[PDB]
Design a protein around this ligand. Structure first.
Ligand SMILES: [Zn+2]
Ligand SMILES: [Zn+2]
Length: 89
């Protein structure tokens, strides 16, 4: 069934991207390869002011038919690695 779990820890920490502000409002005439942001489709589930990037996509070949996660561009993939936020201890 399920092992006793209390207050777990986030899973997709290095798989998030700031959703293009304009895109949301609907004023972003820039494609995915043009805009330095991630623009998730209607099918893909969008998080509150944020969106989760697909896993397989990162590899370049996705299978998930109704993939809920958006596929961010290469120029963006790097960001995920950067992991902005140095450890102060
Ligand atoms: Zn945009
Ligand atoms: Zn995918």
């Amino acid at each position: 069934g399920s092992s006793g779990s209390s207050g777990p820890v986030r899973d997709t920490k290095w798989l998030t991207l700031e959703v293009c502000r304009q895109f949301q409002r609907g004023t972003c005439s820039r494609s995915d390869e043009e805009c330095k942001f991630a623009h998730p489709p209607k099918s893909c589930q969008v998080e509150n002011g944020r969106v989760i990037a697909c896993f397989d996509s990162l590899k370049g070949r996705c299978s998930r038919e109704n993939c809920k996660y958006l596929h961010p561009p290469t120029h963006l993939k790097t960001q995920l690695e950067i992991n902005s936020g140095p450890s102060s201890g």
